[PDB]
Structure formats: structure tokens, C-alpha cells
Design an enzyme around this catalytic site. Structure first.
Site, PDB file in Angstrom:
ATOM      1  N   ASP A 145      -5.278  -8.410 -29.690  1.00  0.00           N
ATOM      2  CA  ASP A 145      -4.738  -7.024 -28.872  1.00  0.00           C
ATOM      3  C   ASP A 145      -5.553  -6.009 -28.407  1.00  0.00           C
ATOM      4  O   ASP A 145      -5.314  -4.964 -28.167  1.00  0.00           O
ATOM      5  CB  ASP A 145      -3.700  -6.431 -29.940  1.00  0.00           C
ATOM      6  CG  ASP A 145      -2.094  -6.946 -29.989  1.00  0.00           C
ATOM      7  OD1 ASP A 145      -2.017  -8.199 -29.466  1.00  0.00           O
ATOM      8  OD2 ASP A 145      -1.425  -6.340 -30.629  1.00  0.00           O
ATOM      9  N   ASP A 158      -7.421   0.245 -31.200  1.00  0.00           N
ATOM     10  CA  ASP A 158      -6.560   0.234 -32.480  1.00  0.00           C
ATOM     11  C   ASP A 158      -7.060  -1.111 -33.368  1.00  0.00           C
ATOM     12  O   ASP A 158      -6.314  -1.746 -33.955  1.00  0.00           O
ATOM     13  CB  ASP A 158      -4.992  -0.147 -32.393  1.00  0.00           C
ATOM     14  CG  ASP A 158      -3.926  -0.359 -33.545  1.00  0.00           C
ATOM     15  OD1 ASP A 158      -4.356   0.311 -34.484  1.00  0.00           O
ATOM     16  OD2 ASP A 158      -3.198  -0.857 -33.438  1.00  0.00           O
ATOM     17  N   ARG A 189      -4.828  -5.497 -39.450  1.00  0.00           N
ATOM     18  CA  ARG A 189      -3.722  -6.177 -39.001  1.00  0.00           C
ATOM     19  C   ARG A 189      -3.851  -6.814 -37.702  1.00  0.00           C
ATOM     20  O   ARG A 189      -3.065  -7.633 -37.399  1.00  0.00           O
ATOM     21  CB  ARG A 189      -2.599  -4.991 -39.119  1.00  0.00           C
ATOM     22  CG  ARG A 189      -2.734  -4.076 -38.053  1.00  0.00           C
ATOM     23  CD  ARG A 189      -1.980  -2.889 -37.949  1.00  0.00           C
ATOM     24  NE  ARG A 189      -2.656  -1.827 -37.543  1.00  0.00           N
ATOM     25  CZ  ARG A 189      -2.948  -0.614 -37.724  1.00  0.00           C
ATOM     26  NH1 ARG A 189      -3.054  -0.575 -39.204  1.00  0.00           N
ATOM     27  NH2 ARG A 189      -3.439   0.291 -37.342  1.00  0.00           N
ATOM     28  N   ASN A 190      -4.967  -6.253 -37.118  1.00  0.00           N
ATOM     29  CA  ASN A 190      -5.244  -6.804 -35.612  1.00  0.00           C
ATOM     30  C   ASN A 190      -6.537  -7.877 -35.442  1.00  0.00           C
ATOM     31  O   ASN A 190      -6.912  -8.073 -34.644  1.00  0.00           O
ATOM     32  CB  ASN A 190      -5.391  -5.700 -34.394  1.00  0.00           C
ATOM     33  CG  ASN A 190      -4.022  -4.998 -34.201  1.00  0.00           C
ATOM     34  OD1 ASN A 190      -3.040  -5.655 -34.208  1.00  0.00           O
ATOM     35  ND2 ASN A 190      -4.143  -3.655 -34.419  1.00  0.00           N
TER      36      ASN A 190
HETATM   37  C1  LIG Z   1       2.594 -19.047 -44.282  1.00  0.00           C
HETATM   38  N1  LIG Z   1       1.706 -18.779 -42.951  1.00  0.00           N
HETATM   39  C2  LIG Z   1       1.619 -17.410 -42.883  1.00  0.00           C
HETATM   40  C3  LIG Z   1       0.739 -16.923 -42.180  1.00  0.00           C
HETATM   41  N2  LIG Z   1       1.112 -17.488 -40.663  1.00  0.00           N
HETATM   42  C4  LIG Z   1       1.072 -16.607 -39.398  1.00  0.00           C
HETATM   43  C5  LIG Z   1       2.032 -15.700 -39.585  1.00  0.00           C
HETATM   44  C6  LIG Z   1       2.236 -14.851 -38.213  1.00  0.00           C
HETATM   45  C7  LIG Z   1       1.234 -14.964 -37.405  1.00  0.00           C
HETATM   46  N3  LIG Z   1       1.094 -14.639 -35.831  1.00  0.00           N
HETATM   47  C8  LIG Z   1       0.216 -15.188 -35.575  1.00  0.00           C
HETATM   48  C9  LIG Z   1      -0.325 -14.981 -34.085  1.00  0.00           C
HETATM   49  C10 LIG Z   1       0.041 -13.667 -33.291  1.00  0.00           C
HETATM   50  N4  LIG Z   1       1.015 -12.926 -33.892  1.00  0.00           N
HETATM   51  C11 LIG Z   1      -0.645 -13.400 -32.061  1.00  0.00           C
HETATM   52  C12 LIG Z   1      -0.464 -12.306 -31.175  1.00  0.00           C
HETATM   53  F1  LIG Z   1       0.334 -11.387 -31.826  1.00  0.00           F
HETATM   54  C13 LIG Z   1      -0.949 -12.077 -30.173  1.00  0.00           C
HETATM   55  C14 LIG Z   1      -1.781 -13.171 -29.557  1.00  0.00           C
HETATM   56  C15 LIG Z   1      -2.114 -14.251 -30.259  1.00  0.00           C
HETATM   57  C16 LIG Z   1      -1.523 -14.480 -31.457  1.00  0.00           C
HETATM   58  N5  LIG Z   1      -1.845 -15.654 -32.255  1.00  0.00           N
HETATM   59  C17 LIG Z   1      -1.200 -15.815 -33.433  1.00  0.00           C
HETATM   60  O1  LIG Z   1      -1.622 -17.060 -34.083  1.00  0.00           O
HETATM   61  N6  LIG Z   1      -0.162 -16.175 -36.138  1.00  0.00           N
HETATM   62  C18 LIG Z   1       0.317 -16.173 -37.221  1.00  0.00           C
HETATM   63  C19 LIG Z   1       0.445 -17.007 -38.542  1.00  0.00           C
HETATM   64  C20 LIG Z   1       1.636 -18.826 -40.694  1.00  0.00           C
HETATM   65  C21 LIG Z   1       2.411 -19.336 -41.859  1.00  0.00           C
HETATM   66 CL   LIG Z   2      -1.858  -2.462 -41.979  1.00  0.00          CL
END
Ligand SMILES: CN1CCN(c2ccc3[nH]c(-c4c(N)c5c(F)cccc5[nH]c4=O)nc3c2)CC1
Ligand SMILES: [Cl-]
Ligand SMILES: [Cl-]
Length: 294
Positions: A171, A153, A157-158
Site C-alpha cells: 500500500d 502509513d 499491518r501494511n
Molecule cells: C491462514 N492464513 C492466514 C493468513 N492468510 C492471509 C490473510 C489475508 C491476506 N491478505 C493478503 C494480501 C493482501 N491483503 C494484499 C493487498 F491488500 C494489496 C496488495 C497485495 C496483497 N497481497 C496479499 O497477499 N494475503 C493474505 C494472507 C492466508 C490464510
Molecule cells: Cl495494527
């Protein structure tokens, strides 16, 4: 609640005490939250590290648990790289399973790119920076392919972006059953994941490193359109018909012919004829070197 039916074996290589973990705000939905970890490295006990923590919801089944465990173990096996989201630790004993991973403070590459489109709130990207982003993503994928990992995938987005603008593939270790994959379910931006899938993955459910390379062609297209949406307005059946007739997306407005040619090669109808990630890493390296900042 029933948590949990089985027993999780301990693994001293990766275990962190629960009280070393200070949970923060939700980052996404299994749900992933921001956390602070005290003394992640056991030679420096008085530093906190921001980390992301994956865990089950209250609704989870034995199957969700098994899947999260599978991702953790795959991540142990695959080892470390600059351009993937790395395993950092785990809380497995005496409470809910926590899988601790690298935190990327600027979020996913799609939104990162969209936020830097010229106005019509940050700064615009040079051609060199776009190519550098492609390059980093290719290096990550090349590392994963060398470890015999098929992503299945790959998409903007990933890809996550750190504080320092380092691209990290995320992922890659998920356990999904491709046969229960519904072609109609949409992402949370509203788009259809089926639009990143190679035709042989789509039609024949055959997933290979070559189909990952098809997906990387689509990701390249995303990058040079600054987070644009592939085949906008097109529903699943019309997509199948486009692919069966050999349709390929148009060259993005600001994008060299060399890079569009790279895209079309990733979209070769014969999988054996697509480039490998190793080749893409070399081509993108050379192109980065020849692309101007200005
Ligand atoms: C204003 N700003 C917008 C972007 N901002 C943000 C928003 C969502 C976010 N998700 C992750 C993140 C994961 N979703 C994640 C995962 F799903 C699996 C393994 C590791 C992961 N590490 C992450 O760092 N970082 C983010 C930062 C911080 C605030
Ligand atoms: Cl997308
Ligand atoms: Cl390692």
C-alpha cells in the site's frame, strides 16, 4: 450500474485477458481477492500463479476509480523490488478494473508476529529472525525512498509475509487526501493509525521520508513486542499531549539496548537528526550479522 463514466486507455505492457484470471476468496476490504492467473508470463502459458487482485465495490464512485488508477500508475512507475508488493498485471478493458499484484500467503506482519508468541499455532522466532524481518522492511523502505516515494502509513499491518517468509511493504502507492484524515477512525484490529505518525505529520500534516522513519521506529517496536499495540488504552487527545511533552515508548522486554537506541533515533524530535533508511539498512545488516540464532 454506470460503470464507467470515462474510458480507460490500454497499456500492452501490463494487460492480461480477463479469462486468464480465476477469481477466488476475499482476502481483505476496494476489495482484494485471491486469484489464480494462467500464463502470467507470456513465455510460460500453462502455469497458474496465485495472485491478489484489487478491484472496486459495487458502491464505488468515479473518485474511487480514479484512486485505484492512481495506485496502479504509481506502481508502474516505481518498478520492482524484493521487499515491496509488486504490480504484476491489470485487466482494464471491457469490464471492471482489476489490478493484479503479488500474493503474500501468510498475511500481514502483525498477525504473523502475534501467532508466534510463546503459549500461555506455530513456532517461536529467534532474535536473529526478528532482526532479519526489520532488515527486510528497511530494505523495502530504502528502495521506495530512493524512488522518491513517501509511504505515509508504514506499520506492521501494511507489511505482508510470503510463503517463504519474505517481508513485503504494501500500500505504498495509495492516493489519500491527508486533510480528510480522521484522527479518530480506527483500524480493523481496533487501533488508532495516528499512533504511527510523526509529530510534524500529526500536528503540521507535513509528510516526509523522515516521518516515514518515525513510523519505522514504531514498526520496530511492534516487531520486538511480537505484534504489540503502541500506547494501549490511550485516546487521540491524550496521545497529542504525550507527544507534546516528549513521551517515548518504553524498551520492549526482549530487545537489546542497541535496537532500542535505534528506535529512539527514529523518534528524534528533530527530523533532520533521524537516521535515513539507507543508514538503517546498514546498521540492521551489521546487527543481523552479529545476532545469534539460538
Ligand atoms: C491462514 N492464513 C492466514 C493468513 N492468510 C492471509 C490473510 C489475508 C491476506 N491478505 C493478503 C494480501 C493482501 N491483503 C494484499 C493487498 F491488500 C494489496 C496488495 C497485495 C496483497 N497481497 C496479499 O497477499 N494475503 C493474505 C494472507 C492466508 C490464510
Ligand atoms: Cl495494527
Ligand atoms: Cl523493473
Amino acid at each position: 450500474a454506470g460503470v464507467s463514466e470515462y474510458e480507460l486507455p490500454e497499456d500492452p505492457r501490463w494487460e492480461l485477458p480477463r479469462d486468464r484470471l480465476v477469481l477466488g476468496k476475499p482476502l481483505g476490504e476496494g476489495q482484494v481477492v485471491l486469484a489464480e492467473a494462467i500464463g502470467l508470463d507470456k513465455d510460460k502459458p500453462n502455469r497458474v500463479t496465485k495472485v491478489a487482485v484489487k478491484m472496486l465495490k459495487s458502491d464505488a464512485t468515479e473518485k474511487d476509480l480514479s484512486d485505484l488508477i492512481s495506485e496502479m500508475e504509481m506502481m508502474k512507475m516505481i518498478g520492482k523490488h524484493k521487499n515491496i508488493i509488486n504490480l504484476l498485471g491489470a485487466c482494464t478493458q471491457d469490464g471492471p478494473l482489476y489490478v493484479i499484484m503479488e500474493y503474500a500467503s501468510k498475511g500481514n506482519l502483525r498477525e504473523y508476529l502475534q501467532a508466534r508468541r510463546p503459549p500461555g499455532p506455530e513456532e517461536q522466532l529467534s532474535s536473529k529472525d526478528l532482526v532479519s524481518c526489520a532488515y527486510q522492511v528497511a530494505r523495502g523502505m530504502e528502495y521506495l525512498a530512493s524512488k522518491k516515494c513517501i509511504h505515509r502509513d508504514l506499520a506492521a499491518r501494511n507489511v505482508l509475509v510470503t510463503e517463504d517468509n519474505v517481508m513485503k511493504i504494501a500500500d505504498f502507492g495509495l492516493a489519500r487526501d491527508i486533510h480528510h484524515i480522521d484522527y479518530y477512525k480506527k483500524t480493523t484490529n481496533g487501533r488508532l493509525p495516528v499512533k504511527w505518525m510523526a509529530p510534524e505529520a500529526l500536528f503540521d500534516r507535513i509528510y516526509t521520508h523522515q516521518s516515514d522513519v518515525w513510523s519505522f521506529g514504531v514498526l520496530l517496536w511492534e516487531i520486538f513486542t511480537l505484534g504489540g499495540s503502541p500506547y494501549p488504552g490511550v485516546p487521540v487527545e491524550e496521545l497529542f499531549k504525550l507527544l507534546k511533552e516528549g513521551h517515548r515508548m518504553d524498551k520492549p522486554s526482549n530487545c537489546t539496548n542497541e535496537l532500542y537506541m535505534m528506535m529512539r533515533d527514529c523518534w528524534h524530535a528533530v527530523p533532520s537528526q533521524r537516521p535515513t533508511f539507507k543508514q538503517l539498512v546498514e546498521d540492521l545488516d551489521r546487527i543481523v550479522a552479529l545476532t545469534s540464532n539460538q
